[PDB]
Amino acid sequence: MKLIDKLPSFDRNYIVEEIQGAYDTELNILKEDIDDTFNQLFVDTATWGLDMWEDILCIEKKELDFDTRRSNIKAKMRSRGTSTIEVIKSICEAYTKSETDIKVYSDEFTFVLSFIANNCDYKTLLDCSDMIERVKPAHLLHYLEPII
């Protein structure tokens, strides 16, 4: 439609018009391709691109829906573990399903975790302790104590 407008007066007949119309349809296809690619540029608008977004994040997994992909990307970046004891204590309680008190001596750097042995099993206790040591400061020394 644009080309025929740019076309001269003597080229106003259908014989000229068919090629221009076909090319205009092709260029409409190309411009919607540009639109799709620009959507792919932004992580929120990119649906299929979220996979190699996660690949940039160096985390790989089969995924259901793009909203969860975006949620996982947002969780992956920042989301720094707080220095607060309470957050980690809440996570430990969620794993162990039992309240845990802390008797920490800054002079001793000593951290202690007390919990009912009946509530939480051996394997999940070990996994929670490994996660804690992954998060807990290296200098600080923690100890998990099961209540008999």
Binding site: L7, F42, K74, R78, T82, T84, V104, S106, D107, L140
Partner: protein, 346 residues
């Protein structure tokens, strides 16, 4: 790059791409289709060049920056409306209801609470800016005017400068803020990181940390209110709870408030004519209060007597005694001199 790719260059390229018996000629029908496709392709090249920049973290627009910071979880600041208190002067008993708007020049301001002229509470009512901005932060003594005339109200002026009006945050400000946030992250027990959270408390201004005060891992937090004056106990408690809400794993935290040091002075001085003991007393106590507010380190007896003699109304001075001594008095940490006794005799 795409700047090199242009109408003429790609046009000639496409013409070369076609092996045909028709000699290339200006204005040819086939030449016409080729030229149109090349024009639109050059436009598309320009679009690609633009989306280079638009895809970058910098040089973004309002929506672009908004999306980026939402991905980062950051949110830009729209600003705050200015807040102040004005005085309504007019017929006594006139009631100005809530929601009334007062205009100073083209600026628009609204009255929060109902105010009655001549009422027991007074004729002063807080007034909030209708919109955000520095322009709404009007200074003191501005003759506000009602947009809608109210019978019994004549003059509206603010006895205090309007404050709280903040502008819309710019893109560069938020970009630099995000870059700083990424560059500097919250750490466990850094002195600056821990002190910043204490600085969030309104009452205190200066914060000091004394680690190892009771062994390893022992942190002694030192605070200072307005010009290093002791804050109230409830302020100390709220600061303690706040820093505990951000404290590292297993710290021992003690908040230390500044202490005052009482000062007793006594001297036998000669007063200038036309001056009484009370006048020289008040002038010298104000001067020495300023000195205490600016004294660094220990007390200097010679400086104290110098500020004494420099005080107006002092013909001569003698027998100057401070806290039972004439020697320089050591000031320890968290200690500020406090004027308590002034024994002046002629």
């Amino acid at each position: 790059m795409y700047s090199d790719q242009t109408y003429e260059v790609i046009k000639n390229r496409t013409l070369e791409n076609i092996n045909l018996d028709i000699y290339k000629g200006e204005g040819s029908f086939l030449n016409n289709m080729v030229s149109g496709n090349n024009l639109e392709l050059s436009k598309i090249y320009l679009e690609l060049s633009k989306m280079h920049k638009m895809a970058f973290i910098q040089d973004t627009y309002n929506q672009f920056l908004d999306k980026r910071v939402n991905e980062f979880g950051v949110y830009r600041k729209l600003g705050t409306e200015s807040n102040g208190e004005v005085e309504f002067i007019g017929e006594k008993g006139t009631v100005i209801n809530n929601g009334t708007i007062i205009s100073y020049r083209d600026l628009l301001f609204v009255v929060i609470k109902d105010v009655t002229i001549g009422s027991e509470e007074g004729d002063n009512s807080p007034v909030q800016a209708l919109e955000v901005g520095k322009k709404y932060n009007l200074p003191t003594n501005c003759e506000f005017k009602l947009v809608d005339n109210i019978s019994g109200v004549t003059k509206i002026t603010n006895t205090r400068s309007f404050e709280g009006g903040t502008d819309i945050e710019t893109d560069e400000e938020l970009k630099e803020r995000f870059y700083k946030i990424q560059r500097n992250q919250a750490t466990s027990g850094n002195k600056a990181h821990y002190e910043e959270w204490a600085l969030e408390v309104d009452g205190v201004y200066n914060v000091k940390v004394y680690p190892r005060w009771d062994g390893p891992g022992t942190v002694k937090v030192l605070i200072f209110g307005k010009n290093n004056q002791a804050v109230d106990t409830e302020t100390i408690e709220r600061c303690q709870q706040h820093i505990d809400e951000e404290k590292p794993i297993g710290p021992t935290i003690t908040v230390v408030t500044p202490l005052p040091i009482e000062i007793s002075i006594s001297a036998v001085m000669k007063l200038e004519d036309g001056y009484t003991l009370d006048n020289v007393k008040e002038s010298f106590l104000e001067s020495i209060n300023t000195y205490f507010r600016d004294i660094r380190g220990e007390i200097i007896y010679t400086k104290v007597m110098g500020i004494l003699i420099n005080t107006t109304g002092v013909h001569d001075l003698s027998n100057l005694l401070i806290n039972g001594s004439t020697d320089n008095i050591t000031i320890n940490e968290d200690k500020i001199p406090s004027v308590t006794t002034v024994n002046f005799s002629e």
